Amino acid sequence: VWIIYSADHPLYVDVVLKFAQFLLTACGTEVALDLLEEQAISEAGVMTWVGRQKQEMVESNSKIIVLCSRGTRAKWQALLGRGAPVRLRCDHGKPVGDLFTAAMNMILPDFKRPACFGTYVVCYFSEVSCDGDVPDLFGAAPRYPL
Amino acid sequence: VWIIYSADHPLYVDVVLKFAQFLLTACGTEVALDLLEEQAISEAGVMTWVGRQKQEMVESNSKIIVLCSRGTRAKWQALLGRGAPVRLRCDHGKPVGDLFTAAMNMILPDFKRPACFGTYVVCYFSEVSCDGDVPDLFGAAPRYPLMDRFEEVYFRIQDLEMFQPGRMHRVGELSGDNYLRSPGGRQLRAALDRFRDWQVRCPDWFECENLEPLLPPGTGIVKRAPL
Amino acid sequence: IAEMGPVQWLATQKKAADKVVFLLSNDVNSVCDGTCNSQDLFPLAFNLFCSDLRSQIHLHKYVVVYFREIDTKDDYNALSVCPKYHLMKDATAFCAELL
Amino acid sequence: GTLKTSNLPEELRKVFITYSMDTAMEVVKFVNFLLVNGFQTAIDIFEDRIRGIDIIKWMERYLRDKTVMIIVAISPKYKQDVEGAESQLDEDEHGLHTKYIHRMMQIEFIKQGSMNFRFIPVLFPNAKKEHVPTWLQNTHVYSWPKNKKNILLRLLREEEFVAPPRGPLPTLQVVPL
Amino acid sequence: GTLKTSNLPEELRKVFITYSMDTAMEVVKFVNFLLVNGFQTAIDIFEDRIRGIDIIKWMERYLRDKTVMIIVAISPKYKQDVEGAESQLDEDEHGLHTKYIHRMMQIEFIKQGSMNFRFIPVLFPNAKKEHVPTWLQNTHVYSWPKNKKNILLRLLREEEFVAPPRGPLPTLQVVPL
Amino acid sequence: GTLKTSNLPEELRKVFITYSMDTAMEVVKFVNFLLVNGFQTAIDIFEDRIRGIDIIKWMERYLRDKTVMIIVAISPKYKQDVEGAESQLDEDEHGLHTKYIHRMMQIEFIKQGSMNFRFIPVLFPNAKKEHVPTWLQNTHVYSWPKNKKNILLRLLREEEFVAPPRGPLPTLQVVPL
Amino acid sequence: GTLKTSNLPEELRKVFITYSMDTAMEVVKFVNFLLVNGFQTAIDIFEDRIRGIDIIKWMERYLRDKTVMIIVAISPKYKQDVEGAESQLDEDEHGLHTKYIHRMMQIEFIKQGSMNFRFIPVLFPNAKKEHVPTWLQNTHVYSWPKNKKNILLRLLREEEFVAPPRGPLPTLQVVPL
């Protein structure tokens, strides 16, 4: 699986990391994640690595997990021309910047067709995030309070 | 305008040159193309010249034209790590690396943002290439099967809307039939038909490549050679 | 559209627009062949409308308009949930709905 | 947590640093930091003898070697030299040498298929992301001294967060209806 | 087609060739080709009468001149010469002179801001693109005799394809709705 | 700071100077500077008695000796001499001797693989970067009196910056998450 | 092939040979070779009758004449003579004369601007490249008997390789698109 998320809070990064740990150890699933892959991201670059992962997931029919949160909602509003440029501390300080926007750019072209929802999984931690934070376009797909 | 293309086939290079000639003659548009400035490329290098052109277009708010073909998608896959690095017959005589791959890697840093897609015009000759050849990067942006929507392409270049409240804007010469009737349009049509015929006759042309009427004299692109 | 990309532009207009109108059939008041073959925004607009419908918020914005009889398609049935207006006769009612 | 040995071979502990003269002081501090942390750093001011024998050969010795990792010290003057007009270079030889090294880095980058395996840009106190050369913007841009830990990890060719081996598939239970 | 007269001033017709011994046979044919086509080629074998007075002065005469175009004849031995000629078991005087010429070319290249105005690498039959010195790879590499037409065009300083002047703008039409 | 004593053997303390008449006074000042600091400088004006026995023998004594450091005093007339001394003056003896010394230095430089071990170009106050012979531009080019400390360090064969001994690789720490 | 006859005037067929005793055996054969090929060789052994009248006058007669080509026979003992003939041995009159001739050749070489118009260094079997005086390493160095044909060509003042007359620049052909 490939996990997509917005670095809203350093604690949220820990949440994502431990969710990946839970998937790897308990769920016996292989996780593709920028934190684990910072070496490859550096070698190939942000956009190239994002495209490679998306192509891998589509080719293998492997699923993509979207971790919606407050930061994802804010960046979605920014995308719709109704939000200020999000400058979260983690993204603003990290060398990477905001990878969520690049992932969206590489994902949105898919939804021009009806059957693209099969590849993606939309998730949100109810305890720290609400279903309302999900981007509108993903809203059409079935949602999961994680 | 600046034309980015992969020299997939000498006939494809011919098609690109015919398109550049058409833009220069019938469209009054100045074309920056690698084949036309090999002196500058030799002096500076593929990456230096590419960076200069990209920066110039962004600063001048000029449009960059991307011509998608099987070679472009092959190189995109190579960048993604799912194909052997492309060594095309045409790029062999040019400086180190690949001009298209360098141009792309110079473009990608722009796509981190949500609104840089305006500066790029994605076009593909429908008769010799298909929409599947356009890199996934450019799916987010509008696509143009060339000469079937070229009038729209020229409006993008001119930065003009084709439609407005209660009125429509058109360019007579660049309309489909008028494009066919235009002098340079006939040359482009002939080159495209030739390349299409070659593709029909040889399904595996790309793997092998990997490793007419007359305008008024002096008005079109001229090919020079010593005796 | 070129600057934003159709999907982002479509979503921007969807959220910004006070009212949204879906047209599912051609006019009959004027005779035409229907021509005056390429990717269009209808499937994406339908997906975004479905998202809003499942949200059950801003349902008032959506309005369905037709002149010729609507086709027998599932997407149109889904859009049928919104108020209907047959502009062949319902011009005034549609105007009031917008205003 | 627990401590563990570091197993980078000494031959891979070579680091080459290219910079502009405006960052000389911070560059010296950075070289001190790297040497203290055990990295064999090659910089012109410290190797001035062998460099004096033949400058171009000296630069080529470090540009050829794939194992050597190159750290690019970004600054307003760096982009002014490498990418700026040549008229300003008439007053500075070190600017010319930095420009040459930049050209060689670009040639290597394209030659490797536009993949940056060993060029590590670094932002120095008076630097901005705008000063980074375009082709380098495609990869991680660290800042000094803020991210020195990340820089050390990168030079060690380690990853900060590392996943464990994939665990066994979970047990599935069946229930009738 | 139509014919265009070549109006290149004679001083620009001067050409100088640097090579290694393995290529000497092919370089003789290359000079035959150039001389037949009107270019004044300066290579040591034909200049030995004048070159013998002072070899270093003879080389410097062509290295100084900006209008002189230099052709680098690449080959497996050429890389060995320009990199480690002195490391050989015996002293190859021609190898050392080739290395010196290469160093002077590199120095001039750097002085100009790494702009290659007058160095034309040419791959000779037994040569591979890997043998090209790295800094020369940043420009067009011609293969002899395959691309001799392009070599002649480059020496004449002419573009193979020449664009016409910017044409007139098209007609703009308005149609009411 | 702290003080250090150089172990430079006496035999390595010999220095030879070649110049042009347009900078005789500055060269005398430079020789004063070097003699005061303990370097045995050989120059024609001071060695007149021994140089008078046989001029060419005197020059060859210092040209043959590998251990002698040669300082080249660049100036507008120095380039003129080493290029066209015989062709521009009525047998300027000093110009011809300077040209001869320059040619011998070039021959030694080429025979060594174009590596400069003991030729130290120095720019004198009226000189410019354009006046340095090209082959000497590939090494450090000092300016007098601006860089006299650096000149002293070069002659002493002591590096201006000393790097501390390289430490071992940093210990690796692992923290579960 | 076709036969050519040199038009060399008889006044230019004079040759003077300077050597050392160790290589006298091979010098005799060299003189045989030159005489059999029509060159008037002046060497002490054959000139002893005239040379005995006044040795220094005999040497100066050939050292003055700019048209006489001087052949320097390089052998291990030749460098020893031209460096330390007077002190490195008990008086060897031939060694002293060889040293004097060498000094006169050097003086002429320096006066001419370090250009070598008529000195032909020839390595003899027991010689090596290190035995060539440095100023003679700036020209063609022949090896006897390996290069004797090239020596004959040099003496005849003919070109070993003849280039064809330069043609006209190629008419440029235009093909429209």
Side-chain angles (χ1 to χ4, degrees), chain B residues 117-138:
Chain B
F117 322 132
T119 301
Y120 302 90
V121 186
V122 182
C123 312
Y124 66 100
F125 299 95
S126 56
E127 299 81 343
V128 296
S129 292
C130 61
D131 180 78
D133 296 327
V134 177
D136 314 67
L137 180 74
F138 301 109

PDB file of all heavy atoms in Angstrom, chain B residues 117-138:
ATOM      1  N   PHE B 117       0.241  25.288 -14.345  1.00  0.00           N
ATOM      2  CA  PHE B 117      -0.032  24.487 -15.534  1.00  0.00           C
ATOM      3  C   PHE B 117      -0.343  25.357 -16.743  1.00  0.00           C
ATOM      4  O   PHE B 117      -0.444  24.845 -17.863  1.00  0.00           O
ATOM      5  CB  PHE B 117      -1.182  23.526 -15.245  1.00  0.00           C
ATOM      6  CG  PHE B 117      -1.148  22.957 -13.856  1.00  0.00           C
ATOM      7  CD1 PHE B 117      -2.281  22.947 -13.066  1.00  0.00           C
ATOM      8  CD2 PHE B 117       0.033  22.464 -13.328  1.00  0.00           C
ATOM      9  CE1 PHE B 117      -2.243  22.437 -11.781  1.00  0.00           C
ATOM     10  CE2 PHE B 117       0.079  21.954 -12.045  1.00  0.00           C
ATOM     11  CZ  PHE B 117      -1.060  21.942 -11.270  1.00  0.00           C
ATOM     12  N   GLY B 118      -0.503  26.665 -16.543  1.00  0.00           N
ATOM     13  CA  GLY B 118      -0.811  27.546 -17.656  1.00  0.00           C
ATOM     14  C   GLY B 118       0.316  27.682 -18.662  1.00  0.00           C
ATOM     15  O   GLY B 118       0.070  27.803 -19.864  1.00  0.00           O
ATOM     16  N   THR B 119       1.564  27.669 -18.193  1.00  0.00           N
ATOM     17  CA  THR B 119       2.688  27.971 -19.074  1.00  0.00           C
ATOM     18  C   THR B 119       2.971  26.842 -20.057  1.00  0.00           C
ATOM     19  O   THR B 119       3.775  27.013 -20.979  1.00  0.00           O
ATOM     20  CB  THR B 119       3.931  28.270 -18.233  1.00  0.00           C
ATOM     21  OG1 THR B 119       3.665  29.386 -17.375  1.00  0.00           O
ATOM     22  CG2 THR B 119       5.125  28.592 -19.112  1.00  0.00           C
ATOM     23  N   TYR B 120       2.330  25.690 -19.889  1.00  0.00           N
ATOM     24  CA  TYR B 120       2.615  24.517 -20.705  1.00  0.00           C
ATOM     25  C   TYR B 120       1.413  24.167 -21.567  1.00  0.00           C
ATOM     26  O   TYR B 120       0.287  24.081 -21.067  1.00  0.00           O
ATOM     27  CB  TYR B 120       2.997  23.334 -19.819  1.00  0.00           C
ATOM     28  CG  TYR B 120       4.192  23.640 -18.963  1.00  0.00           C
ATOM     29  CD1 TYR B 120       4.042  24.185 -17.700  1.00  0.00           C
ATOM     30  CD2 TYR B 120       5.472  23.416 -19.429  1.00  0.00           C
ATOM     31  CE1 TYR B 120       5.132  24.481 -16.922  1.00  0.00           C
ATOM     32  CE2 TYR B 120       6.566  23.708 -18.661  1.00  0.00           C
ATOM     33  CZ  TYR B 120       6.392  24.241 -17.406  1.00  0.00           C
ATOM     34  OH  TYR B 120       7.490  24.533 -16.632  1.00  0.00           O
ATOM     35  N   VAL B 121       1.660  23.973 -22.857  1.00  0.00           N
ATOM     36  CA  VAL B 121       0.642  23.575 -23.821  1.00  0.00           C
ATOM     37  C   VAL B 121       0.993  22.172 -24.282  1.00  0.00           C
ATOM     38  O   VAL B 121       2.068  21.953 -24.853  1.00  0.00           O
ATOM     39  CB  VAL B 121       0.576  24.545 -25.011  1.00  0.00           C
ATOM     40  CG1 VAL B 121      -0.583  24.200 -25.930  1.00  0.00           C
ATOM     41  CG2 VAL B 121       0.463  25.980 -24.523  1.00  0.00           C
ATOM     42  N   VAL B 122       0.095  21.225 -24.041  1.00  0.00           N
ATOM     43  CA  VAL B 122       0.344  19.816 -24.312  1.00  0.00           C
ATOM     44  C   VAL B 122      -0.364  19.461 -25.608  1.00  0.00           C
ATOM     45  O   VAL B 122      -1.597  19.514 -25.683  1.00  0.00           O
ATOM     46  CB  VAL B 122      -0.138  18.925 -23.157  1.00  0.00           C
ATOM     47  CG1 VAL B 122       0.179  17.469 -23.438  1.00  0.00           C
ATOM     48  CG2 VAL B 122       0.494  19.363 -21.845  1.00  0.00           C
ATOM     49  N   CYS B 123       0.408  19.095 -26.623  1.00  0.00           N
ATOM     50  CA  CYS B 123      -0.127  18.797 -27.939  1.00  0.00           C
ATOM     51  C   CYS B 123       0.452  17.485 -28.438  1.00  0.00           C
ATOM     52  O   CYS B 123       1.593  17.137 -28.133  1.00  0.00           O
ATOM     53  CB  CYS B 123       0.193  19.914 -28.932  1.00  0.00           C
ATOM     54  SG  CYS B 123      -0.183  21.568 -28.314  1.00  0.00           S
ATOM     55  N   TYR B 124      -0.346  16.757 -29.208  1.00  0.00           N
ATOM     56  CA  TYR B 124       0.104  15.516 -29.815  1.00  0.00           C
ATOM     57  C   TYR B 124      -0.589  15.353 -31.156  1.00  0.00           C
ATOM     58  O   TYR B 124      -1.787  15.617 -31.279  1.00  0.00           O
ATOM     59  CB  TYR B 124      -0.186  14.312 -28.916  1.00  0.00           C
ATOM     60  CG  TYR B 124      -1.655  14.034 -28.725  1.00  0.00           C
ATOM     61  CD1 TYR B 124      -2.290  13.035 -29.445  1.00  0.00           C
ATOM     62  CD2 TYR B 124      -2.405  14.764 -27.819  1.00  0.00           C
ATOM     63  CE1 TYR B 124      -3.632  12.777 -29.273  1.00  0.00           C
ATOM     64  CE2 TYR B 124      -3.747  14.514 -27.640  1.00  0.00           C
ATOM     65  CZ  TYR B 124      -4.356  13.519 -28.370  1.00  0.00           C
ATOM     66  OH  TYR B 124      -5.696  13.261 -28.197  1.00  0.00           O
ATOM     67  N   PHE B 125       0.171  14.932 -32.158  1.00  0.00           N
ATOM     68  CA  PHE B 125      -0.366  14.734 -33.500  1.00  0.00           C
ATOM     69  C   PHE B 125      -1.189  13.453 -33.492  1.00  0.00           C
ATOM     70  O   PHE B 125      -0.646  12.346 -33.484  1.00  0.00           O
ATOM     71  CB  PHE B 125       0.763  14.680 -34.520  1.00  0.00           C
ATOM     72  CG  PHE B 125       1.582  15.934 -34.571  1.00  0.00           C
ATOM     73  CD1 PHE B 125       2.758  16.036 -33.847  1.00  0.00           C
ATOM     74  CD2 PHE B 125       1.175  17.013 -35.335  1.00  0.00           C
ATOM     75  CE1 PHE B 125       3.516  17.191 -33.888  1.00  0.00           C
ATOM     76  CE2 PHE B 125       1.929  18.170 -35.384  1.00  0.00           C
ATOM     77  CZ  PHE B 125       3.101  18.261 -34.656  1.00  0.00           C
ATOM     78  N   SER B 126      -2.516  13.610 -33.500  1.00  0.00           N
ATOM     79  CA  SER B 126      -3.411  12.474 -33.327  1.00  0.00           C
ATOM     80  C   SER B 126      -3.158  11.371 -34.341  1.00  0.00           C
ATOM     81  O   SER B 126      -3.289  10.190 -34.003  1.00  0.00           O
ATOM     82  CB  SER B 126      -4.863  12.940 -33.432  1.00  0.00           C
ATOM     83  OG  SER B 126      -5.089  13.604 -34.664  1.00  0.00           O
ATOM     84  N   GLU B 127      -2.793  11.725 -35.571  1.00  0.00           N
ATOM     85  CA  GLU B 127      -2.618  10.725 -36.616  1.00  0.00           C
ATOM     86  C   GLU B 127      -1.418   9.824 -36.368  1.00  0.00           C
ATOM     87  O   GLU B 127      -1.414   8.680 -36.835  1.00  0.00           O
ATOM     88  CB  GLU B 127      -2.467  11.406 -37.979  1.00  0.00           C
ATOM     89  CG  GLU B 127      -3.662  12.250 -38.404  1.00  0.00           C
ATOM     90  CD  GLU B 127      -3.670  13.630 -37.767  1.00  0.00           C
ATOM     91  OE1 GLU B 127      -2.956  13.828 -36.762  1.00  0.00           O
ATOM     92  OE2 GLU B 127      -4.389  14.516 -38.275  1.00  0.00           O
ATOM     93  N   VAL B 128      -0.407  10.307 -35.643  1.00  0.00           N
ATOM     94  CA  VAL B 128       0.813   9.548 -35.402  1.00  0.00           C
ATOM     95  C   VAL B 128       1.055   9.278 -33.926  1.00  0.00           C
ATOM     96  O   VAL B 128       2.003   8.570 -33.587  1.00  0.00           O
ATOM     97  CB  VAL B 128       2.037  10.256 -36.018  1.00  0.00           C
ATOM     98  CG1 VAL B 128       1.904  10.316 -37.530  1.00  0.00           C
ATOM     99  CG2 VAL B 128       2.192  11.649 -35.441  1.00  0.00           C
ATOM    100  N   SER B 129       0.232   9.819 -33.033  1.00  0.00           N
ATOM    101  CA  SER B 129       0.375   9.563 -31.607  1.00  0.00           C
ATOM    102  C   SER B 129      -1.006   9.599 -30.973  1.00  0.00           C
ATOM    103  O   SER B 129      -1.946  10.185 -31.516  1.00  0.00           O
ATOM    104  CB  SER B 129       1.313  10.578 -30.951  1.00  0.00           C
ATOM    105  OG  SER B 129       2.640  10.399 -31.410  1.00  0.00           O
ATOM    106  N   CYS B 130      -1.115   8.965 -29.808  1.00  0.00           N
ATOM    107  CA  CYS B 130      -2.389   8.804 -29.126  1.00  0.00           C
ATOM    108  C   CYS B 130      -2.316   9.476 -27.765  1.00  0.00           C
ATOM    109  O   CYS B 130      -1.237   9.767 -27.245  1.00  0.00           O
ATOM    110  CB  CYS B 130      -2.755   7.325 -28.970  1.00  0.00           C
ATOM    111  SG  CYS B 130      -1.571   6.370 -27.995  1.00  0.00           S
ATOM    112  N   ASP B 131      -3.493   9.711 -27.183  1.00  0.00           N
ATOM    113  CA  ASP B 131      -3.558  10.373 -25.886  1.00  0.00           C
ATOM    114  C   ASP B 131      -2.833   9.574 -24.813  1.00  0.00           C
ATOM    115  O   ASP B 131      -2.418  10.137 -23.794  1.00  0.00           O
ATOM    116  CB  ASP B 131      -5.014  10.593 -25.486  1.00  0.00           C
ATOM    117  CG  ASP B 131      -5.152  11.286 -24.151  1.00  0.00           C
ATOM    118  OD1 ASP B 131      -4.967  12.519 -24.100  1.00  0.00           O
ATOM    119  OD2 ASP B 131      -5.444  10.601 -23.149  1.00  0.00           O
ATOM    120  N   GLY B 132      -2.670   8.266 -25.016  1.00  0.00           N
ATOM    121  CA  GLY B 132      -1.975   7.458 -24.029  1.00  0.00           C
ATOM    122  C   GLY B 132      -0.501   7.792 -23.918  1.00  0.00           C
ATOM    123  O   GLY B 132       0.154   7.404 -22.948  1.00  0.00           O
ATOM    124  N   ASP B 133       0.043   8.504 -24.905  1.00  0.00           N
ATOM    125  CA  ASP B 133       1.459   8.846 -24.886  1.00  0.00           C
ATOM    126  C   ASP B 133       1.754  10.085 -24.048  1.00  0.00           C
ATOM    127  O   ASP B 133       2.925  10.363 -23.774  1.00  0.00           O
ATOM    128  CB  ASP B 133       1.961   9.047 -26.313  1.00  0.00           C
ATOM    129  CG  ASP B 133       1.894   7.775 -27.137  1.00  0.00           C
ATOM    130  OD1 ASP B 133       2.085   6.684 -26.560  1.00  0.00           O
ATOM    131  OD2 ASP B 133       1.649   7.866 -28.358  1.00  0.00           O
ATOM    132  N   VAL B 134       0.737  10.832 -23.642  1.00  0.00           N
ATOM    133  CA  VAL B 134       0.975  12.043 -22.850  1.00  0.00           C
ATOM    134  C   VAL B 134       1.382  11.640 -21.436  1.00  0.00           C
ATOM    135  O   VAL B 134       0.692  10.819 -20.810  1.00  0.00           O
ATOM    136  CB  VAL B 134      -0.272  12.922 -22.831  1.00  0.00           C
ATOM    137  CG1 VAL B 134      -0.047  14.139 -21.949  1.00  0.00           C
ATOM    138  CG2 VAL B 134      -0.641  13.351 -24.237  1.00  0.00           C
ATOM    139  N   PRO B 135       2.472  12.179 -20.890  1.00  0.00           N
ATOM    140  CA  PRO B 135       2.875  11.798 -19.533  1.00  0.00           C
ATOM    141  C   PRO B 135       1.787  12.109 -18.516  1.00  0.00           C
ATOM    142  O   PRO B 135       1.048  13.085 -18.645  1.00  0.00           O
ATOM    143  CB  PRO B 135       4.131  12.639 -19.289  1.00  0.00           C
ATOM    144  CG  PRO B 135       4.666  12.910 -20.636  1.00  0.00           C
ATOM    145  CD  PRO B 135       3.474  13.051 -21.525  1.00  0.00           C
ATOM    146  N   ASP B 136       1.701  11.261 -17.487  1.00  0.00           N
ATOM    147  CA  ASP B 136       0.681  11.447 -16.462  1.00  0.00           C
ATOM    148  C   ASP B 136       0.790  12.819 -15.818  1.00  0.00           C
ATOM    149  O   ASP B 136      -0.205  13.357 -15.323  1.00  0.00           O
ATOM    150  CB  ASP B 136       0.807  10.360 -15.396  1.00  0.00           C
ATOM    151  CG  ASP B 136       0.971   8.980 -15.992  1.00  0.00           C
ATOM    152  OD1 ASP B 136       2.023   8.725 -16.613  1.00  0.00           O
ATOM    153  OD2 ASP B 136       0.050   8.152 -15.840  1.00  0.00           O
ATOM    154  N   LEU B 137       1.992  13.393 -15.813  1.00  0.00           N
ATOM    155  CA  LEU B 137       2.186  14.732 -15.273  1.00  0.00           C
ATOM    156  C   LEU B 137       1.215  15.722 -15.901  1.00  0.00           C
ATOM    157  O   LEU B 137       0.659  16.587 -15.218  1.00  0.00           O
ATOM    158  CB  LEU B 137       3.629  15.164 -15.518  1.00  0.00           C
ATOM    159  CG  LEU B 137       4.042  16.546 -15.025  1.00  0.00           C
ATOM    160  CD1 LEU B 137       4.182  16.549 -13.513  1.00  0.00           C
ATOM    161  CD2 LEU B 137       5.334  16.968 -15.702  1.00  0.00           C
ATOM    162  N   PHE B 138       0.997  15.607 -17.211  1.00  0.00           N
ATOM    163  CA  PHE B 138       0.233  16.619 -17.929  1.00  0.00           C
ATOM    164  C   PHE B 138      -1.241  16.265 -18.069  1.00  0.00           C
ATOM    165  O   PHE B 138      -1.975  16.999 -18.737  1.00  0.00           O
ATOM    166  CB  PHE B 138       0.851  16.848 -19.306  1.00  0.00           C
ATOM    167  CG  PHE B 138       2.279  17.301 -19.253  1.00  0.00           C
ATOM    168  CD1 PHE B 138       3.301  16.458 -19.644  1.00  0.00           C
ATOM    169  CD2 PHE B 138       2.597  18.572 -18.809  1.00  0.00           C
ATOM    170  CE1 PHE B 138       4.614  16.873 -19.595  1.00  0.00           C
ATOM    171  CE2 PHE B 138       3.909  18.993 -18.754  1.00  0.00           C
ATOM    172  CZ  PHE B 138       4.918  18.143 -19.150  1.00  0.00           C
TER     173      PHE B 138
END
